[PDB]
Design a protein around this ligand. Sequence first.
Ligand SMILES: O=P(O)(O)O[C@@H]1[C@H](O)[C@H](O)[C@@H](OP(=O)(O)O)[C@H](OP(=O)(O)O)[C@H]1O
Ligand SMILES: O=P(O)(O)O[C@@H]1[C@H](O)[C@H](O)[C@@H](OP(=O)(O)O)[C@H](OP(=O)(O)O)[C@H]1O
Ligand SMILES: [Cl-]
Lengths: 313, 313
Amino acid sequence: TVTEPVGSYARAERPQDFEGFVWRLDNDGKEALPRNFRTSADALRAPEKKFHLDAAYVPSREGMDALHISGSSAFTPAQLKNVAAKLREKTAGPIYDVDLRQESHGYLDGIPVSWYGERDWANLGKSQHEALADERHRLHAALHKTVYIAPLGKHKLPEGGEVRRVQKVQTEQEVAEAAGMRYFRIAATDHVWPTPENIDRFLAFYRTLPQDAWLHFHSEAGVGRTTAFMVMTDMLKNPSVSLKDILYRQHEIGGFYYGEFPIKTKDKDSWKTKYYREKIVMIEQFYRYVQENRADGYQTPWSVWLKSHPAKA
Amino acid sequence: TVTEPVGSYARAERPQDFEGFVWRLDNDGKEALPRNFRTSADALRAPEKKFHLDAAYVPSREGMDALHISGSSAFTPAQLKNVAAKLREKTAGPIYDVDLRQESHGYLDGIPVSWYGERDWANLGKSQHEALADERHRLHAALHKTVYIAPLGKHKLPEGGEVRRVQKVQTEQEVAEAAGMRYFRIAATDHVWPTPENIDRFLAFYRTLPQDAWLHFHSEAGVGRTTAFMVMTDMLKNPSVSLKDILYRQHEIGGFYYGEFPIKTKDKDSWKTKYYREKIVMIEQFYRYVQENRADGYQTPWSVWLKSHPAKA
Ligand SMILES: O=P(O)(O)O[C@@H]1[C@H](O)[C@H](O)[C@@H](OP(=O)(O)O)[C@H](OP(=O)(O)O)[C@H]1O
Ligand SMILES: O=P(O)(O)O[C@@H]1[C@H](O)[C@H](O)[C@@H](OP(=O)(O)O)[C@H](OP(=O)(O)O)[C@H]1O
Ligand SMILES: [Cl-]
């Protein structure tokens, strides 16, 4: 009777309506660091107004000093070494660049770009294998070819930018390993809740980690996907902390807020409304997964548990 | 000794530096007519101040009534039908759409676009054969594909525009024949003086026209290349008219002035300067070709004559 369960709404959208049409500039490389850079060691600041939170609530910091995670937006290669260098002061563990982007991206002549389709959905519906093969094929195709690279402006369309003939092409994995970071890819679709596949892959990965591993999450802006995986990591590693505290603290170090709040979008942005609501419900559902399955050591994965414990809108 | 004779400066430029990167919007289709629409039967207007001409000068109209030519910018299909209907009111002869554009262009869902490279030079150096081959391959490749079409804005780079999955592809040949016009293509490079190859093709074409043929020339903006062939036609068919009159009258009906004038360029447009100067010289040289070959019936092709009678800087 149910075509798309809650948590899988994006499956109803049609990928053929969002195919990539331009190399989008992911970071202009002007600053020393990527945007929205934050670490779990950072001091808590006031909530953003739009979330209508209790400014005076002080969330527990239980486990934060030990969390060892960070988040950021996309970066140039120089910016990533600066990140790696900053993080290397805080740990002697391996540092992972955890790349949460389903969209095909890489570096053309050291410039960080992505193949941008409407809503950033150019790889919508593809398996991780298919997404990455596309990415590799496209990047290789750009070498010694003329390309147009532009930032998005008015109404999410190209505005200015530049044209060049590319002399070097790199994957983010190459750039990460050049900055001394290990690399882990989770192909998560922009704007929406990560898929069961996304999270099963993340959970098995998390399970292989040495104790002193530091996880640096990033996506395009370092907001939606980055925060979702920061929050999930926090819940997994610190299961005795309350839902509310996890969400308050991940927001107040510079993340998105993943609890209820009054959503009011502009008209041309109202397609986002139900995707926000979906993420809120799924955040609660993941919390529940952790509480019920951590005891036995996660004998049953998220994808399976969720099919027998469907979320409700 | 001499690497590139006058008339062939553009041959020294390197094609690989101007390769196409975007589907440019050739006309937004808001007006009923293309821009710079004019006919050889129009009233003369005041010259443009930037050319510092004698506004009191009354050029001879000898032969203009019989000249039967027109010019305009690029157009949508509906705009072309409007052009064809207006011209049909002036003549009962065959009406020609003379397409002077070297750049690859056509129509996607009826939208006039072109494959734009910097300086509009994406087909620089190609034979007319190779250029049309590029055009056919690109137009066809766009069918059922997602494309980005954009007007150029600041600094000749894409600004805004639209994204669509293309359901229909046509050549300008198709669009012209659909509007009741005969089609003739001369692949002339934007900004520069037409090659001897271009001019030879046009002269052989001119020599096969019925007496009542009406030539509608057009290029991207209907200024540079369009005026050059309107002027050439005026000289071939009205050989007894003075260089000065021709140039004055072709400007005063709405064309470019192809005589000497104080060139005032911007900085980012100083690359233009020598190409303007080249054209003024080659215009005079063509006139000389007309005068010296009007008598033996144009036995001698422009390209061979020009090689023995090279023009000087
Ligand atoms: O790429 P990430 O790190 O997942 O972050 C998202 C990304 O920057 C999107 O482009 C953005 O959409 P908009 O440009 O439409 O804001 C979205 O904001 P929103 O969904 O909160 O608007 C972010 O959450
Ligand atoms: O396509 P056509 O009819 O040959 O007309 C030319 C075309 O519009 C060029 O883009 C334009 O250069 P700009 O974009 O630099 O103006 C040039 O003007 P200019 O060479 O007089 O500047 C025109 O002559
Ligand atoms: Cl199971």
